[PDB]
């Protein structure tokens, strides 16, 4: 009872609480049933990902306000058994994957507010009641500017959100907010494009207040750390950027060194973590992150497929997801990239259950506590999503 | 409901929580019962100052090993009614009144380890659960060594622990941690002596390991930080307290200007500020500290005493403490200086009631909370805390 | 057009400073036509906001360089 | 006649003087025998390479606490005729042969004790009065703490000191001890740093006494894997400097001219370990003449790892003894691994003596000069050392 | 523990006379002090002759007497060698006006002070100083680098004309070091870095090791609230590199702060004055510990910051005999031999009466650090010691 991570379970009944104690079988369908009712809340998505097969892809194309400039149709072909590959396969064609949709396709006005409308739409059927879309409006601007990018993709959202306007207290189905990645064309002086970066973020956090509407909450920091230099330049740049109340979080990815944790979180001063699974082999880094509140992101279906793990039980290493949650870190599980992995948070949840043995039904419920106490809103809005979440769990 | 401080509430009667939600009547006998039987945090005392009048000074100075050399026996004159002076008074004169205890007479083992034993008494009658003192080991030593004195101070707290021993599951009754705050006599070159107490503090908790024990937790950087010199000295010599596993805990002092609290939170790192009365006008530092999670140490009576403010109703403004309590920032209750002020935790928060019309009983509650929840202590202690004060709440 | 500084230095003026160059750089960037009005330049007047509290961030003045804008410096008093 | 190391040689008279300025033939018994009763000083000393293989070893294994989990006895061979090889041999194959006694044996404090006494009484026996063994106590730590093996060391070593008490009831030998950094470069080396310095500047400290074991000074080197590490000591060395502590650097391999120049300049170092290519820079040669800085060479071990041709048979260039002490540098003479190169203070000056052709005996007394002139004690003991060596010196 | 190795030579009452306190009356221990060998390390060019008979005989050396600045020489206060209150340093500046830039930018004038200073130096039996001046002063046509090259010229010409035989070298050795300029209204940074650049090309351009040559450089005080903080970095490490040798003077205040900052971060290896050491142990010892050197000048100090005399009577005792005793580097240097009018001999003298009890084997004891401490080369410490050693009178 008093570690119960929800109050209102404290009004359920003795069979339900130990029905809740018990490990989680995720091939019986009432338990998938039941994870298709959870609300949830959703932290890591890309919005460059979401519609790269199928009808959806047609749907897209076919929305277009220049239908002469649209590039041939050609769908890349999914590995052997794409959604549980046999075999990790590398980033750059995990990538490619993805070819048929993104920087080739969002360029035309037409297509960019299909594609939202639709994520949106799936966001609402798939339950979630709190997202926090990533995009990067450099990329998808040739003749226009990032600023008008930014606006439409604003504009787009708001217009939906308005639109759908459910009744929790009056209050729309699905908040959405925005964070700023970097860019990729990284040829020139990536000095000029990271300055480009945050004084665009700067200025969209400062130009839009109303809190109750899609608002850049923070920048993202993709890294690309090849050199220390880069560290250097960013750090004087969030000198800069912490005065006007901007959060940060950084993408741990490739060789996921110590070093470059330590310096992400004692002199960046991120609040988030991408990845960085390799956490238990320094008990120092461990216990810092654990004490000082910093969350960690999780990506079940993209860890495996990218860089392959042991399923059902039977070198890679175990998922070291109950040991963060055995240790008091935050960890949330996020869908990462929708169209690429080619499944939703509902799966990506199951398979997580599957990584794992033992996960019990409560696990579930305190990683939902965990992203809702890391998110990046307000404390009004913190409040409200606490009572919704409370107040909207299915009993068995 | 599910805004409760705690799970253990829910299952409580409408009536009992309809009291609750009345405001707090700070001269009823009952509530007075009742504030007294609650389990309590302490996060802010001191050693120095613990019997500075009284038959308590007397039972210290005739405890001495060798009273050959013990200073004449004189009580300094408080001023017209010390517990609530009616006009502020500068703290040099709050710090000269408690003169008769303190370097003079902790220069003598005995006279350390009684006032050791008479603290950790006095600490078990109040009914705290958890405390850190701080101390400052080189002030008393002139022909002993600090390791010394700190080794001294450690085994009669430990000794005082394995005495008691109560049985809530084994455990001692209240535990005792550690702070090192720096020294006063700022007379020869500051760099050697914060150089030795910073190189004490890190040596002192490589030695003691044990997690059942007390041991050292975190050092203090006090008003000797060097702000007049070029901004402090960055972040040179702390880089290696980080790593070692330290907690800093900054002190505002005079001024108390905002840019100095901008430098210890995002340079520092720190995870605590002392006292900090003026944070509500710049809202964007304090939706920054609300944000990140950083606590707020405050001790009324001090206040009171030195600063000044109105009470009961009747420049300085009101008293900051109903207004960071609904912003959301993590307020605490302590004693400061218990021989100096004269006063103890109850009456702290009987007179932290007194000051804040309006202030109700859950908020007491809501203080403890945010007092465990920013503590020092690991995750299975900061478990074991929290079902006992959960478990510890009397009904009215 | 040329964006000068503001004169309420009531809140944090780093913050200030640091707004006023996003401003620059987000303008400069979003109007490139060559026969129109455009952003061209900032004035860090009032010696940014005089050395008394700001000095010369000098590693903070590298990104205007870079993104194509000219620096104007007023001189008021004293003048040293 | 000026230019006579002591007062003491100008009563010596014309016979002495004219047996002085002769060559020193290695291989004659009267010559050894005098070399043999000089009085010695010895500056680079390592703790864990005294006893390795012998009977010696058979007597540190006997006296043991723990005998159940002492590991298997195991003596790496020797390579062809070790104690002059005719070929060099890496640093690498130079520590793996020694691994007989080191981490794995001296985690028990009898064998500890042990060895410290054996040390001692060797040292006794040679005749050397004064020495300066370096030591690094987190190696010989995995169930205590480095303050618990510190505490043994100069308990030990103390206890034999008040044993021996031979000159005007001083002791027969004074020891100090050198803090050396350790080698497991696995965890952040930043950690191991600061605990390093730590207890360097705690125990020099904790013990005062001018006439005890004390600590003297820390060793700034053995971890050279980016320079921008000793650019963070240039940061942080200030507080090893104002607390009252020597700094000594060890140059090794490769030996670039741009790291003595900012260890001189830069780390303030006093003493030098090898850098055997000096005459390649005047400037730099000019430099440290002048401003006093010491050298230490070892013969044996340079000639065993470096490799240098023997009676001038003719490639490494020549020695650079004599050219050094031609120059004005002070140079000295050393041990390094008593152990491992198995030669003790005597041979290695004869070597010495063998490998530079033209060598007399006033340079020795010369050497013996600059050696007492570079150490870390105090000016006290300085001249009290200057006299018994100047009485000590034996006739032929 | 003797300072030399020939005074194992004498006999056991020289001895024990040597072992007793030296008497600054007796005229018998005058003529003995007049006649050691000395070593000079702090001596001013630009204040030699300020008053008397050398005044007109440099005057009367000039080349173009029309523009000759008008006699008038400043009158010293109530007597100016042991005076009864201490003035100000200012007012010590002023009290030698009559010499200085206003003489010395004429070039005989120039000329025929070097060569006065030259015998002066040889008559009071000096074998090794290092005169100090600053070449930036006395130009206001020529550039610096003639005045200097006109130094350097006279002072070799002496040097060269005198050539007595101890074994062919010449009587007396002559170093040069360069000082910051006076004139400090212009841009700082442009004079530092003037002066630098100027002794670094001086260095390297005179290399032969029997003349004079450039040796170091003063980096004075020139450094005042944050150009200490900023000056007091790189651009000083470069003339390491270069190959020079630095001295700080440290003058008014003399807080610990400036001395620490000066021995660990500008690497020098003299100080001058710094006469307060004592209030802080580990600065004591770090000092005596390195090897720095400590250069105090008796009159000065007696007539600027006040001092007891005589055992009698809030300055403290004189901090010598103490340095003495606890291993550092002490000298007895002159200063200003114009302004205070004393020589070597007088201010070994009034030093000896400034602490009661010093023997007479403290003063080879201050020979012999002057020797160890000078900026000379291992060949000339060799043969400076081969003289000094050589030369003691016997009593």
Redesign the interface.
Known sequence: ????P???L??WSEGELAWLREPLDPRAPADQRWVAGLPKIELHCHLGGFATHGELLRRVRNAAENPGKLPPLEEPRLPEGWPLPAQPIPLAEYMKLGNANGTALLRDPGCLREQCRLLYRHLVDQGVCYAEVRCSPANYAEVR???DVLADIRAAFQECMEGARTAPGGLPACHVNLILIATRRASG?Y??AI??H???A??AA?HWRDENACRVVGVDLAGYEDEKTRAHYFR?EF???????L?VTVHAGENDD??GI?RAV?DL?A?RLGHALSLGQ?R?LL??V?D??IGVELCPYANLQIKGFRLDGSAPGPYPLLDYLR??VRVTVNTDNIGISAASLTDNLLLAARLCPGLTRLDLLHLQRHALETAFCT?TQR?TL??RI??GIPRP
């Open positions: 009872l008093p570690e119960l929800f109050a209102d404290a009004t500017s990032p600023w002086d000095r000029a300055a480009r945050l004084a665009l700067v200025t400062e004087e000198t800069a950027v912490h005065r006007c109340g959060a110590a070093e330590w004692f001063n609040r320094s120092e216990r810092s654990a000082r509140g240790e008091g404390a409040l606490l009572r409370s107040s």
